[PDB]
Design a protein around this ligand. Sequence first.
Ligand code: 3PE
Ligand code: AMP
Lengths: 98, 320, 55, 40, 49, 115, 120, 347, 175
Amino acid sequence: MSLVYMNIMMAFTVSLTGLLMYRSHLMSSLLCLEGMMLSLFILATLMILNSHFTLASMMPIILLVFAACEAALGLSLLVMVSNTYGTDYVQNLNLLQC
Amino acid sequence: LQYGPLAYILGEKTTKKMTENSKLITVDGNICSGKSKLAKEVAEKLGLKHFPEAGIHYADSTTGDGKPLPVRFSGNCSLEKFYDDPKSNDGNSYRLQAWLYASRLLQYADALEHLLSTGQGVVLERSIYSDFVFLEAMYRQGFIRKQCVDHYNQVKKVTVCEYLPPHVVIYVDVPVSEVQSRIQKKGNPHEMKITSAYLQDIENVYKGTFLPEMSEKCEVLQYSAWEAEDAEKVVEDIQYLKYDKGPWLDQDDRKLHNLRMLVQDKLEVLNYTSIPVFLPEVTIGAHQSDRVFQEFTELPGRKYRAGYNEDVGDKWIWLK
Amino acid sequence: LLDLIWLETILPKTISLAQMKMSTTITSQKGLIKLYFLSFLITILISTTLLNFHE
Amino acid sequence: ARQWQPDVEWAEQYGGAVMYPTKETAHWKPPPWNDVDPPK
Amino acid sequence: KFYIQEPPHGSPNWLKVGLTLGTSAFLWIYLIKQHNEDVLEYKRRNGLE
Amino acid sequence: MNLMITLLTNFTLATLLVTIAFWLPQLNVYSEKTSPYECGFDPMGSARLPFSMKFFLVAITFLLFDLEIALLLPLPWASQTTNLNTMLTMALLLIFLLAVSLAYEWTQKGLEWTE
Amino acid sequence: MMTGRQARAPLQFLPDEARSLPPPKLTDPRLAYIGFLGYCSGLIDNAIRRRPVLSAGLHRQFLYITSFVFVGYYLLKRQDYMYAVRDHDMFSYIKSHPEDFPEKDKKTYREVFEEFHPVR
Amino acid sequence: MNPIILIIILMTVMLGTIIVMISTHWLLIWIGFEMNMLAIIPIMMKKHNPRATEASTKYFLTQSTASMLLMMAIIINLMFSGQWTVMKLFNPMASMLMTMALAMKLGMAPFHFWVPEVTQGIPLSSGLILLTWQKLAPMSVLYQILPSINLDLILTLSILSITIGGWGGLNQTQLRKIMAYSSIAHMGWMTAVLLYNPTMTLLNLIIYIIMTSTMFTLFMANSTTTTLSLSHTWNKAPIMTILVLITLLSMGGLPPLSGFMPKWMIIQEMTKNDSIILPTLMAITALLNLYFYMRLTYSTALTMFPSTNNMKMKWQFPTTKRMTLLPTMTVLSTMLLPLTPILSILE
Amino acid sequence: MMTYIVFILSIIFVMGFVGFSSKPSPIYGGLGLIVSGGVGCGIVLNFGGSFLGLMVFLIYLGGMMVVFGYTTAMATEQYPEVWVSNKVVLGTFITGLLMEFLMVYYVLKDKEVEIVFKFNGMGDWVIYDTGDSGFFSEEAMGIAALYSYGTWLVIVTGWSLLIGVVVIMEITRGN
Ligand SMILES: CCCCCCCCCCCCCCCCCC(=O)OC[C@H](COP(=O)(O)OCCN)OC(=O)CCCCCCCCCCCCCCCCC
Ligand SMILES: Nc1ncnc2c1ncn2[C@@H]1O[C@H](COP(=O)(O)O)[C@@H](O)[C@H]1O
């Protein structure tokens, strides 16, 4: 297939491995979920604008909506981690190991 | 049942009946402080409901026919044998203290249930916030062990965190010599075996640990012995209080609804009094527990649920 | 020797110790998000490169 | 002469954070009873 | 009078007893009507009369 | 094409007002003039400490209400449709759901700041 | 397996052709076992709430029995329908494909040679 | 929580599962999963303690990663098929990514690393919602894409789930982690029979949901969250020990109980397809699940662990709890095996 | 090399993704994600989606301003890692960049490449339509159809945003 899908899928995989390998800091990986949403947006939108399947043009908007509709969720779940502990480090969330 | 989330949805908000008469007042003091009439006197001035101090048989007084059950079914302990042999081998001291803490937890649940269901305030005597002073006096006198104090602290840590403090705590300064004089004038031969150091430790855990930590979350009213004889002065001091401290001010309908759904379920109130901490004072073994449980089932009015007993005269069981 | 030790050794006790040992290795996790998702990445890389489940 | 029923020594085997305590699973205290932690 | 407090199940909840017996009688008469309609429809679709 | 030329020109003579702002005057560097500013006195602690946000629930709800102007924005184009009562119903449904959201955030004191 | 059958008529618990089948009797032992499950549910319900197990709540036990018999009647109807569909599709597929199902010529045991294996 | 808000949030969890079940479009599947996760996060944080916040953070990260992989599988399907219909997938890469996404959403091993953590952190009611209602939408999507699921992948996930969920529960004394490793092993059983007969997948799902709802309702009715607190039940309500006995012996796959019903039928559908080794290893590995079930029955029903003195107060108070459908679910989880050919209604 | 403009913007997209995916600090994570979301609205704007690129630019600008406020309020340390402070940040940053320009070099020299899929190496101008859409940009018509045709999508999206507000206010309470 076309050349740009290589790099947009590459950016998805880069953001995937960035999300899936934590650096002990939860906000730095909540950016990686938002980057995966960006890469899925641009990939789906290139496919939809390419093929002129115009009725799915409303699809990435909807996709983008649920992007922040979980990203806000993560931030609402970031502040409860950072109120229990002074930092949002992910290694403070190990109480459920026993 | 009678109360639930559906009653809360259909309009029964529990601050629609929360008036200025709805005050939970706990009267405290030493062993013979003379508070025993004083609380009732407050309950005949402010129009409140007096609860007596939870003995061993408070749960017996709330369930069944209200009569006290035999002590092998409730307590498995004796206050008089604690007065006779405090350092006993069978561990009667902490077993009595744990049963009294569970009874006061039940009484405080009954108090909050009355306060949140009817809007009438309750006058208690030695609630669960003041129960630890007898534990600490018993531990300073060497009556119990440190593992008993750790068991009490675990049970208190997981039970008292779900409740609110009282609005008013009334404390009665009576010195140790006057307590001993009132014990000698009382006439109870077991109660006259209370040592002076135990009374002094009760007064020390009162004045040093209880009141300095309760003065922030409620309003203390510390009286002497002669001015607690006049209830009109005490009730006049209650009626002109400026209720500003404590977590009762930031209570909406939702928090008091959650509290009322906790409070009316008595097995959830008493859920953590029987935690599986195997302590030799309170752990009853398997065969004794089986024997006393099967003897408890054979009591009149105790074999089934509270409306399903033919031996006490419950009718229409086949339609219930 | 046989019917208290060795016939007791071969079938039931070795199987019991093996399931105990595997149970303690499975449940010895340190409760960390970092290690769990790094294991997820290694799973994805083994599925693609090593096992070819995308074929 | 009567039926054996378990004692404290038998029943405390089931009270740890795990069932088979190894070197790694040795510092694991059991979780709190109401599952509520001090705010630290 | 035995119990010191009036229990929740001292008297039968006659609204709930009436709902229980009415629901059960309705389900039985609807089941028997459905079964008679089903055997009549079987005998009609197969001519087994 | 012309857009990238215009942005290149704007970025170029915005960064060439900087390279003649650093390299034209005479520099006198000593390690007290480049210190941070705390009204003359030395700053107590770093400014990389956590500066606690009081408006955090409003900041998270801004993420949700900013999506609404990705949904309410095609209305000048949605008004051009030939199923128009349905469009009008769905548009008023979206603004009404935003308004129900704002009313819920009001009455549960979510718009107020903490402390 | 039969998912493409119930795709032209979706979400039909009992279709129209299910009325061409005999319904279960009300004395069906499967239905009597489901009614026994209702009675056992009534007994467990009186047991866990510490009611007298046989005497208390006869209306409640009777609605347990009635509700299980009522649900189980339609469950047995749908069961018998789906097995009749299974057999109908089996027989129609065997009939429409004769080359896949040849008529076997069952030889008698005077021509069939079996190796004798002596137990000695 | 305000009960109107609790009703709306639970109806939104149900709405997300229904939107996954009824929709023919991939974007609506993804919307249903997003709505399901988004609404179930405050059910986990109903109590507001650090363990619920940790469980909700781990659950959000796992389910968000799974939904990312799901939407990437959807977009690769859009490339290689030009369409959005919820049916088989037209690329093995999208098939692998969607199978990984659904295996993460089920908590199947080796993506199982969140189910004991999240299940222990949250209450018993929200743990019931997690282990039953959240196993309905990914099983819908797996039921719908089985012409494209890789055989080796779903069987590796299945037997790895059965083995890891067997070994995990042996080292547990917490009841929620026991039910979570039980969940892992049972999802392995459901997905192993997925490509052979998905009616048996639905049968195992329904019988599992009945037995798990029975066990969590018994735990809530007894207010027990550990093994050693479940062991006091004989001194308080001895019928509950009988119910957990019959339900735990049912969950182990012992005849004549209904939990033997799915397992046997799964074996009955895997030997038809000339697979003999794999259901044999699955059956033998289910003995580990049976072993920690038998451990719980020893501690609860078959022996009498020593109780405390304060239990004597709880003799005087009955249960005012809503034990909703507990006798019905207890009868259905134990005495349903003579009605085994009822599974044809799931065709 | 001007026909490769969408490819060049896509290289800058992957460079921004290696920039914030190495996770230096969410200040610079927000920087890299703004750079990627700003060249990604230049990738997709050259396909005809001028509405649908400006929105992923604008929504993510609001998003990274919010994320900035939180990483200055919650996710803050005394010495934030810029791009090079940690060896594990710089190592994987250089690794992602070298592997990205490696697959640039293998796709311009060979004009075909294969990582899992097969990809062309010609400029992606080749696949565009040779026709005109008249007096409507078709992506604007399709997003306008969210009100006429997308009624169920409106209902589930507006309900999800409503309960998103309700869910977030139920989480961020503490009691
Ligand atoms: C192939 C697709 C098949 C689809 C079938 C769909 C059938 C219906 C849905 C079944 C799915 C699981 C349902 C249970 C989800 C959990 C519900 C829940 O948690 O409800 C909350 C409530 C809590 O009780 P409470 O004590 O008040 O709480 C204290 C504070 N939390 O109450 C509880 O926790 C108590 C439990 C209530 C619900 C249990 C009964 C329903 C499920 C059991 C099977 C019933 C038989 C019919 C259906 C068969 C199929 C499942
Ligand atoms: N926790 C406790 N431990 C021991 N004795 C107690 C405890 N609480 C109350 N008492 C006794 O209860 C009596 C209360 O005195 P009165 O003021 O007459 O009610 C005294 O005998 C106290 O010693």
